[PDB]
Design a binder for this molecule. Structure first.
Ligand SMILES: Nc1ncnc2c1ncn2[C@@H]1O[C@H](COP(=O)(O)OP(=O)(O)OP(O)(O)=S)[C@@H](O)[C@H]1O
Ligand SMILES: Nc1ncnc2c1ncn2[C@@H]1O[C@H](COP(=O)(O)OP(=O)(O)OP(O)(O)=S)[C@@H](O)[C@H]1O
Ligand SMILES: Nc1ncnc2c1ncn2[C@@H]1O[C@H](COP(=O)(O)OP(=O)(O)OP(O)(O)=S)[C@@H](O)[C@H]1O
Ligand SMILES: [Mg+2]
Ligand SMILES: [Mg+2]
Ligand SMILES: [Mg+2]
Lengths: 315, 322, 172, 257, 256
């Protein structure tokens, strides 16, 4: 076996589908050569590490093995490491083309201690002629102010439905798997902008049931079906909604967090009802979510959420 | 003298009940030799740990102690242990092994974001030389990157058949007699948790059996585990509904004091009883559910219990006027 | 005051101004940063011995022409003093003691002066405050950079960049 | 396809050369020209300058087509040079536009060849030119006695005062637990010339140096048995150790009054 | 009397035997039988397997009616052996219900009886399982040169790659400060057989080892003056130091 999130990883900067302007800027940087220190921030699973990896590859060509120092969460990143190894790598002699430079790729920089990030300022400022730093973090708020001041911030937005759909189309074209539009829509729904999670769910569905159909996708994701959730959030009488929640969703052992998240994601795409009622139902669902997350996942909370949703949909 | 929670533990795969859907799949997986990282998540008292230890035993034979690394919750694992111990165990090659090593983390949902990132990176780096298994009670508390690396398996609580079969088995290996309504009370109070059943059974065995042959009634099983009683619940409900304020308040205080019950159990039982009533107005149900959920959320933060009890009484009374 | 203490928001010109002031008067700069192990013993051995010495670089570079009589001296620039982490035990106390009993100019640079960690530097050092530069100077500098880089920018975009950067010149 | 090929007749020569000043210098540039090897480097505190000249008469084979600069750390160099045994020949090789340097250890009567690679370190060389000055005092004394005097005086205080007056050397140290003084008089010995103290002076001088710098300098007393000292009232002291084909010079600046 | 009586020729022999695996093993159980003493143990990381055997030829008086197990700590045993002069003779004496082993240093001209008791820490984890007897390549070379090359290449990295091609033994190391390659060739020296290099090759081999375990192995260089190495792919390598009446062998596991 081989994970499809690892076999179909983009190795060139052009294969990455997503934010077009940032990718164009990175392509121009790789074509020119003058690359500055950069912090890449964004949500998980939208191609942050892969982006800087393809950037370093296209920049260094055959020198990736000698002019790239990658540090992830597995390696030790303390005071001694930053003071010794990074410093000795920055001063390391290397003959490169006039535009290229050495690259230090620090993945998950938001996990590095403040003291360790402190000892990198002068290291990255004094050796700016032969060393360029590339940090990759999920939260740009945990990086100290001098570091954020020294490098340019590149924000990555969540993936739209069209780009994920095109990537899945390319994957199924190259993999020769049978599918339907309903299964693709279900995968886009359950992926909520996570390309890696989308590819993983597609591979799981293919390996489990072969045919990519909405039923198989919602069976392998082990989440409440959006159809029955929409039926619960649109009943005319509150009694039928409570019965649907009791017999069909609560008896099957579904987690309250999963039920609330599915109701949230269904109310967002419920194009039938108006905008104000959608926003208010989303507010109520989020209040119920906050109540559940605070240590009380009682069925009474979901019952009250349904009661409020019904009262708001009737008023 | 070993506990029934530990004595009746399934030592192999065929002795876990109510989880056939996952048992057949894991059997096929260990028979095809394509065992990936497994994320066993679900409510407690279901059989995750027993299933995984039985699988590890069936795979490794006598090499269990040398080829299986059992790791637990926080245990002072800030960033150090996941960085050194797990990494070495995944990197250290055994001396006479033909295969891969297994590291099983129990209730690993309590790890911090940095620890979860370190763990997922370790899994990514050594996915070819070892396999990982993570146990969890809530799959939402884990980083969405760790989920996309392994295969998930939800452990839906045991149905009635598995629990009654296990009650039969524990009655075979122990001289106890159980009343027909005793097993009904047990399955109603268990909520599909075998651990609590095996905990409550030994307690009643220890306390009640003077000649080791008595009959366990609903009274003792309700008293030991500290659970409400349906008759008492209905009496409190009727007293709140029909009688006036002084009498209903006094009855509620007497019930919640002379038996040692908490307001959370009273509220959930009251709403469970009210679920099936044929009330005329729907605004009644709306107000009832809203106010009861508000009272429960406020109780969750530890207020003055008398005030929330009076508020429960007032809400129940004021909702039934339409 | 024996020692001067520079502080202010990040990227406003502390290190640049310090280095330029030290290099204009003909002095010799001995700079130490957070990327060096400034413990108690290393400060007692490394820098303490160089407190009252003369530069061999400043001597062998140029000492024959009557340019200045302080070219054989030291300006000790301790940069990023607020960044001494847990791997530097006793560094603050030893640096406060070095703020006295010295014979050469000692300039300390930090970001937050009112931090409780920087307490021992209460009265022993002259602390002047660097503030966020005004928008006009940043606009003039950006216009100079643009006219040197051969590109024209709308003065509204420059003001909006100054607003989003909150005064950081290195950031703009 | 190599620029320079250098062949040391003994492997221990370069080992001792590097060990002589590996305690005061961390990064160092080696300028390889047709005349030999020249390498100068300032201390981390910019108080002790180390210069080293190894002429072509010390290499068994030495091409050095055109001058090159090899910047390398002394710690890794001492770690690499430590491997070789006594009965081996050492060969230094640098490729065109060198990113590393090759050190070969070969045996005279065995096919055991040990090749090591060392990654060069980029160093912004602030090359300062040193001119010959008329030092007020110039002398030479056995390196063992000088190292003994330094190790003896440095235990009392952190500053050693050297005074040359009336054909008399005086090393004094004023500490907290007390004081210490050592007086040296020049004399010649016909049976053992290596135990004779030379003296040439123009004006009496008085200088003050640190204890750590002297303790670091005296460690190079394993290259030659006689060390030369040049002192001036306004110039940094010069401590010279002569090698059979060059020298090693330590420029140490005095303290203030 | 005693069931177990074992006398050595000198005292510096057991000293170096215990010094052999003093850095990779904490506790060990010696099996005393009629044919001599045997022992084996594994490290806490389960990578290095030490096996010691000494027959009845290195001893002078050996009497053990039935095999006995002595599980004892090595650190305290070395602390005890440190007090022994090079002119004494050790006499291990053991009785029924083994709970305390008695060492006795005795001289033959001056009356110096040094008796020391040592408690027995029983672990009951023997697990003696040896299966492989056929290796891909074999070689023998002076232990001094091996230890020299090991502790010379250990500074550059943590993984040393030993590869045996056609009559060219090669040790490689690659790290951050540089690289290192030691290439040796077999040769027979008639003037000194102890400085010869013997090699038997069936197939070319190439495999890596850890620097820490190799440094722990080379610490047993005081036993003999010539070490034997047996390499075989997908098989633990064997490092053997012979002895006048036995051997000390380390089984090492390769890396990835
Ligand atoms: N824009 C994209 N186009 C194509 N494939 C993508 C894209 N973004 C992600 N992927 C796929 O998702 C896989 C994993 O994405 P990663 O870049 O490793 O995640 P990430 O951006 O680093 O976020 P983290 O590491 O979880 S914080 C890649 O190997 C790709 O196969
Ligand atoms: N399916 C089952 N069949 C029989 N006994 C079970 C079953 N599940 C649990 N038990 C009993 O309950 C004990 C504890 O089970 P565990 O596997 O530890 O529960 P769990 O699913 O791991 O959830 P935890 O441990 O509370 S996080 C076992 O030793 C058994 O005695
Ligand atoms: N007043 C200024 N005018 C022009 N450029 C400036 C000015 N201040 C800072 N810069 C730019 O910012 C760069 C670095 O400024 P520094 O003074 O070194 O930052 P800093 O004050 O030390 O703050 P830290 O140390 O990062 S917290 C300089 O090389 C200039 O390019
Ligand atoms: Mg990443
Ligand atoms: Mg368990
Ligand atoms: Mg600065």
């Amino acid at each position: 076996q081989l994970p499809w999130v690892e076999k179909y990883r983009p190795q060139v900067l052009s294969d990455i589908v997503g934010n077009k302007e940032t990718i164009d800027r990175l392509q121009q940087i790789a074509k020119d050569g003058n690359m500055p220190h950069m912090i890449i921030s964004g949500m998980p699973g939208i191609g942050k590490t892969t982006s800087v990896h393809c950037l370093a590859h296209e920049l260094l060509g055959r020198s990736y093995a000698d002019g790239v120092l990658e540090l992830n969460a597995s390696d030790d990143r303390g005071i001694d490491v930053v003071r010794n190894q990074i410093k000795h790598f920055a001063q390391k002699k290397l003959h490169l083309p006039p535009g290229k430079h050495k690259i230090v790729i620090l993945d998950e920089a938001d996990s590095m201690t403040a003291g360790a990030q402190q000892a990198l300022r002068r290291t990255m400022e004094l050796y700016s002629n032969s060393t360029r730093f590339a940090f990759a973090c999920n939260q740009s708020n945990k990086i100290i102010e001098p570091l954020q001041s020294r490098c340019a911030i590149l924000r990555y937005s969540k993936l739209s439905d069209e780009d994920v759909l095109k990537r899945l189309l390319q994957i199924i074209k190259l993999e020769d798997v049978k599918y339907t539009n309903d299964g693709l829509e279900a995968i886009i729904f359950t992926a909520e902008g996570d390309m890696r999670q989308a590819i993983n769910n597609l591979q799981s569905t293919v390996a489990g049931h072969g045919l990519v159909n909405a039923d198989n996708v919602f069976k392998i994701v082990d989440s409440p079906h959006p159809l029955i959730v929409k039926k619960m959030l649109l009943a005319s009488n509150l009694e039928d909604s409570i019965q649907i929640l009791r017999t069909d969703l609560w008896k099957k052992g579904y987690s309250s967090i999963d039920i609330v998240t599915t109701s949230f994601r269904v109310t967002k795409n419920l194009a039938q009802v108006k905008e104000s009622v959608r926003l208010e139902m989303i507010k109520e669902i989020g209040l119920t979510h906050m109540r559940i997350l605070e240590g009380v996942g009682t069925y009474l909370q979901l019952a009250s959420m349904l009661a409020k949703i019904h009262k708001l949909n009737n008023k | 003298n070993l506990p029934w929670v530990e004595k009746y533990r399934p030592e192999t795969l065929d002795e876990v009940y109510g989880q056939n859907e996952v048992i057949t799949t894991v059997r096929k997986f260990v028979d095809e030799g394509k065992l990936p990282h497994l994320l066993f998540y679900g409510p407690p008292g279901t059989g995750k740990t027993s299933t995984i230890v039985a699988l590890a035993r069936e795979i490794y034979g006598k090499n269990y102690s040398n080829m299986v690394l059992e790791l637990n919750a926080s245990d002072d694992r800030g960033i150090d242990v996941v960085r050194n111990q797990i990494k070495d165990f995944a990197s250290t090659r055994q001396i006479f092994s033909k295969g891969f090593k297994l590291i099983i983390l129990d209730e690993a949902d309590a790890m911090t974001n940095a620890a979860q990132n370190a763990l997922r990176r370790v899994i990514e780096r050594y996915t070819k030389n070892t396999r990982f298994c993570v146990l969890a009670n809530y799959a939402h508390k884990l980083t969405p990157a760790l989920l996309s690396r392994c295969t998930r398996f939800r452990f839906q609580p045991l149905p009635q058949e598995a629990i009654e079969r296990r009650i039969a088995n524990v009655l075979v290996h122990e001289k106890l007699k159980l009343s027909p309504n005793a097993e009904k009370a047990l399955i109603e109070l268990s909520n599909g948790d075998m651990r609590r059943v095996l905990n409550v059974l030994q307690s009643c065995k220890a306390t009640l059996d003077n000649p080791d042959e008595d009959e366990i009634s609903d009274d003792v099983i309700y008293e030991c585990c500290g659970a409400p009683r349906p008759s008492d619940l209905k009496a409190v409900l009727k007293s709140i509904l029909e009688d006036d304020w002084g009498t209903a308040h006094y009855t509620l205080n007497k019930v919640r004091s002379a038996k040692g019950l908490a307001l959370i159990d009273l509220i959930e039982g009251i709403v469970k009883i009210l679920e099936d009533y044929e009330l005329q107005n729907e605004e009644t149900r709306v107000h009832l559910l809203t106010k009861l959920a508000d009272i429960e959320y406020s109780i969750s933060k530890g207020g003055n219990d008398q005030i929330q009890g009076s508020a429960v009484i007032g809400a129940i009374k004021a909702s039934f006027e339409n | 005051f024996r020692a001067a203490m520079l502080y202010g928001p990040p990227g406003i010109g502390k290190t640049t101004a310090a280095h330029l002031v030290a290099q204009e008067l003909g002095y010799d700069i001995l700079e130490q940063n957070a990327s060096d192990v400034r413990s108690k013993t290393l400060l007692n051995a490394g820098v303490k011995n160089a407190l009252d010495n003369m530069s061999v670089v400043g001597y062998f570079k140029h000492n024959e022409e009557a340019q200045n009589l302080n070219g054989k001296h030291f300006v000790i620039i301790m940069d990023e003093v607020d960044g001494m982490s847990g791997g530097d035990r006793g560094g603050v106390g030893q640096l406060a003691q070095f703020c006295r009993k010295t014979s050469t100019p000692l300039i300390l640079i930090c970001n937050e002066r009112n931090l409780p960690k920087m307490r021992p530097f209460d009265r022993v050092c002259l602390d002047i405050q660097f503030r966020r530069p005004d928008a006009n100077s940043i606009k003039s500098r950006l216009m100079t950079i643009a006219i040197r880089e051969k590109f024209k920018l709308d003065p509204n975009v420059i003001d909006r960049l100054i607003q989003t950067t909150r005064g950081d010149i290195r950031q703009v | 396809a190599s620029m320079l090929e250098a062949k040391f007749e003994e492997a221990s020569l370069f080992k001792r050369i590097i060990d002589g000043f590996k305690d005061c210098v961390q990064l160092v540039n080696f300028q390889c020209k047709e005349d030999g090897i020249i390498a100068q480097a300032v201390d981390d505190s910019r108080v002790l300058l180390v210069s080293l000249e190894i002429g072509v008469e010390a290499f068994q084979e030495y091409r050095c087509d055109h001058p090159v600069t090899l910047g390398m750390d002394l710690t890794s160099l001492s770690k690499i040079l430590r491997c070789g045994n006594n009965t081996d020949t050492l060969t230094l090789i640098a490729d065109n536009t060198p990113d590393s340097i090759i050190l070969l250890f070969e045996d005279t009567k065995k096919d055991r060849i040990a090749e090591y690679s060392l990654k060069l370190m980029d160093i912004d060389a602030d090359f300062l030119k040193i001119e010959e000055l008329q030092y007020d005092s110039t002398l030479s004394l056995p390196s063992s006695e000088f190292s003994k005097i330094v190790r003896d005086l440095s235990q009392l205080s952190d500053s050693i005062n050297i005074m040359i007056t009336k054909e008399t050397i005086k090393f004094v140290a004023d500490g907290d637990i007390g004081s210490g003084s050592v007086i040296i008089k020049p004399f010649v010995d016909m049976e053992h010339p290596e135990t004779s103290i030379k003296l040439e002076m123009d004006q009496p001088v008085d200088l003050t140096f640190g204890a750590k710098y002297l303790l670091d300098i005296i460690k190079g007393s394993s290259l030659s048995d006689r060390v030369g000292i040049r002192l001036s009232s306004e110039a940094p002291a010069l401590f010279q150790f002569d090698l059979k084909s060059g020298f090693l010079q330590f420029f140490l600046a005095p303290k203030f009054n």
